[model samples]
Target: KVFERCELARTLKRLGMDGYRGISLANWMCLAKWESGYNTRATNYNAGDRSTDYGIFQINSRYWCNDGKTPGAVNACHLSCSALLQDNIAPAVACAKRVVRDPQGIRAWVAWRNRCQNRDVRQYVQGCGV
Candidate 1:
């Protein structure tokens, strides 16, 4: 499922993404935009670690979820990577929350660091009425 900007904003807001772990909703929106373009089933295989990033937030298997093939992978989120691919984004959102609990916070995602950090991200929720 591919979500529009406001659609995803509203969804993420309802999922408690706003101010989650000190990260704003707009920042979440920005991360999703760059990470997976709001596509629920998006997948990116990382040749570097033989791990795959899955779903809207692009949660990875090497550290977050179990995909059974990532070398020495840890299922920190205790989720199957398939759960992150569902049209219902609840599972992915849950895993994303787990990701920020670490000291790195939202910087866990390099995409967020390069594209959203220190950037004007208000546009992501400006017209969402979220």
Candidate 2:
């Protein structure tokens, strides 16, 4: 989580996204709260039917896994734990910035807010102060 957020902030800053440096830190904290509740080991399971989501981001391997039926390719995969520990926030933040830059408006932040419901996490949009 720390690496990802830091990388995200760095990427946004490099992309010339105004106000990014100020908001990315808050964004990281906010996302951590909602996505994983700051628990890197957190996981969700539904028994009887047998389904599960795992890891800090609550990513599900069944949906995201790749690499010849191996779950390690998935972000939620246990083998990918090291990668997860690395800087992933940068990619995520860059992705968010790309969406914002496509239309050349910070309004993309609102779209992200809607999609992620990050606003519901803290009642304030990160980087937008709304």
Candidate 3:
């Protein structure tokens, strides 16, 4: 989660999502907590198949894994959290932000959580907190 937070914050800054004069550390913490429970190696195993959706953002290899082509592409044929982090954090953040920017906004994240059936999670993006 730490890596994902750092990368996400960096991406948000690049995209002009900083709160106030600068990015909010507290908001980042809250977002990180609400996103993946600080699990850097998290994956959605509940999908009934072992897929390579990894890291705090739970990015799927099939979607963004560029096989070392993109800025954050990993050399691995299959995506891994470490590889994704090594490649670049922007793609993950951008993807996440795109989802958030949808009509649902942060609710999209909530929908992912609900689709995964993780009911214990909390909402943090409902009020532009992040």
Candidate 4:
């Protein structure tokens, strides 16, 4: 499912993404905007590691979700990578939370660093009464 900016903001807020683990809703918005353009089924394959990133937040197959393809994957989120591509988004959101619980925090997403970090991310959540 493709989401509008404010729709995604409200949805993420309802999912308790606002200030989750010290990461603000705007940052999450920024992350999703750059990672998948708020598209639930977006996917990108990593040729170097043979791991794929799945869904809105681009949760990786190498360490988070099991794809049965990435060699020696840890499956820290203990879910199938296919689950992250669902329209529901609940599973993707839950696994994203687990990702930030690690020491890397939101830095787990390189796209977030290159696109959203240390910038005026407030633009992502402005208006829409979020």
- Count of clashes, each model: 0, 4, 2, 0
Off by over 4 Å in 1: none
> How many residue-pair clashes does candidate 1 contain?
0
Give the candidate number with the greatest lDDT: 1
* Comparing 1 and 3 on lDDT, the stronger one: 1
Off by over 4 Å in 4: none
* Tens-digit per-residue lDDT, 3-108, candidate 4: 9999889888899988889999999999999999999999999899898999999898889999998998889999999999999988999999999999999998
Candidate 4 lDDT (Cα, whole model)?
0.92
TM for every model, in the order presented, reads: 0.98, 0.36, 0.43, 0.97
lDDT of 1 by residue, 1-117 (tens): 999999999999999999999999999999999999999999999898799999999998999999999999899999999999999999899999999999999999999989999
Model 2 Cα lDDT, one tens digit per residue, 15-41: 554355334444544544455655545
Ranking by TM-score: 1, 4, 3, 2
Of candidate 1, the 10-residue stretch with the lowest lDDT total is: 119-128
- Provide the lDDT at 35 for model 4: 94
Task: Write down the lDDT of every candidate, Cα atoms only.
Answer: 0.94, 0.41, 0.46, 0.92
Clashing pairs in model 3, backbone N/Cα/C closer than 3 A: 72-87, 72-88
Which of the predicted structures, 2 or 4, would earn the higher TM-score when compared with the native?
4
